[PDB]
């Protein structure tokens, strides 16, 4: 087996900018090469076979170089409609192998998160279990830090995360954080706590509630 | 076309139609993009149906084959295992797809309905505890679409859980009945809660 080392796995990038992705054999693979584009669900396109040779129809901006060990796909200059992922694979050898990928993603401003946490429904608790939901919504620099804090000593067990591909009409991300109790086990303390830090602020935004107003 | 869920062991036999081109001229592939978007080679067929090329993952197990006259694409996978669980596509010889897909999912689990529990500005829904992931949640119908938020289910042990949040105007919340619309259609289930105040 030849294991196809891409990078890097994720690249921002602003449209216009042009991009350089890596897709490195463990072995002489030679001019078999060959790349695909993957936008949100879409099977995969071909976009250049062999190395350098593209598809016709595929645009300009687009093209492909390297042999033996090394090949780069280039985007002289990115258009919204480029991001999504990119796979490499080859064709020489034993089992046909592919990359991990690249996610292009796209560049924007700093974004604030805009944060709520929402105590058990009423519902959940007649069942014996205490959800306590917390959502971070809209924010930009993916790297978020959520912590939670039952009457302010922080828990990280049973906490249950979750996040959302880049929003196609914003560019932000957004997550849902989710500490699991039993309702015996949540009736216990008083307040709960979702912290989270993030690159638009120095302090952490916080929210909180406790079991009885 | 042949997907599903089936349980470990299982056989299933996925079906691939072609048309605009001639079918007997190419070399046919099957090929598999694992949950977590890994890409993977199944099988190969050569343009008469001659030679069959196999990894290892599923040498023996898997049986690709076709039939140049109806222009049918078959792969038989047998003895199935959890790792097979992916979506599997077909493509004509580097690659060229022209598949659109068809999710195989291999589990010992049970099919089971979801609870659905209100979270009362933002509000949100709690899908929790349903099997075969398809879900789907709009609220008020899907009228109200802009400032929803439907986040990757993520499966606690043996079922999944997933919220989605709505961010509607403040005038508008208590004043307007504002629902969540959640749909299993793997046991025919749909449930509607009202997101209430206090």
């Known amino acids: 087996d030849i294991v196809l080392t891409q990078s890097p796995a994720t690249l921002s990038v602003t449209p216009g900018e042009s991009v350089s992705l890596s897709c490195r054999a463990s072995q002489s693979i030679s001019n078999n090469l060959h790349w695909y584009q993957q936008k949100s669900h879409e099977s995969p396109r071909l976009l250049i076979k062999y190395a350098s040779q593209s598809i016709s129809g595929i645009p300009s901006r687009f093209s492909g170089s390297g042999s033996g060990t090394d090949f780069t796909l280039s985007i002289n200059s990115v258009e919204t409609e480029d991001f999504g992922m990119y796979y490499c694979?080859?064709?020489?050898?034993?089992?046909?192998?592919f990359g991990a990928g690249t996610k292009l993603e796209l560049k924007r401003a700093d974004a604030a998160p805009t944060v709520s946490i929402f105590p058990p429904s009423s519902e959940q608790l007649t069942s014996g279990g205490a959800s306590v939901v917390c959502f971070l919504n809209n924010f930009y620099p993916k790297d978020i830090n959520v912590k939670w804090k039952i009457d302010g000593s922080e828990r990280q067990n049973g906490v249950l995360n979750s996040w959302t591909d880049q929003d196609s009409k914003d560019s932000t991300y957004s997550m849902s954080s989710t500490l699991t109790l039993t309702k015996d086990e949540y009736e216990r303390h008083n307040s709960y706590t979702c912290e989270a830090t993030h690159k638009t602020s120095t302090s952490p935004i916080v929210k909180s509630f406790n079991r009885n107003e | 076309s042949g997907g599903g869920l089936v349980k470990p062991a299982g056989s299933l036999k996925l079906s691939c139609a072609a048309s605009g081109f001639t079918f007997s001229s190419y070399y046919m592939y099957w090929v598999r993009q694992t949950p977590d978007k890994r890409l993977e080679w199944v099988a190969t067929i050569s343009d008469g149906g001659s030679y069959t090329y196999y990894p290892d993952s599923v040498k023996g197990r898997f049986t690709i084959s076709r039939d140049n006259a109806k222009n049918n694409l078959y792969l038989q996978m047998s003895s199935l295992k959890s790792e097979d669980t992916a979506m599997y596509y077909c493509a004509r010889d580097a690659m060229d797809y022209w598949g659109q897909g068809t999710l195989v999912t291999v589990s010992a689990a049970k099919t089971t309905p979801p609870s659905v529990y209100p979270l009362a500005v933002t509000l949100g829904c709690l899908v929790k505890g349903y099997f075969p992931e398809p879900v789907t949640v709009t609220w008020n119908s899907g009228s109200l679409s802009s400032g929803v938020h439907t986040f990757p289910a993520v499966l606690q042990s043996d079922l999944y859980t997933l919220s989605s949040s709505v961010t509607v105007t403040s005038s508008t919340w208590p004043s307007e009945t504002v629902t969540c619309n959640v749909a299993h259609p793997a046991s025919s289930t749909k449930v509607d809660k009202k997101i209430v105040p206090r």
């Open positions: 694979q080859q064709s020489n050898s034993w089992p046909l192998t």
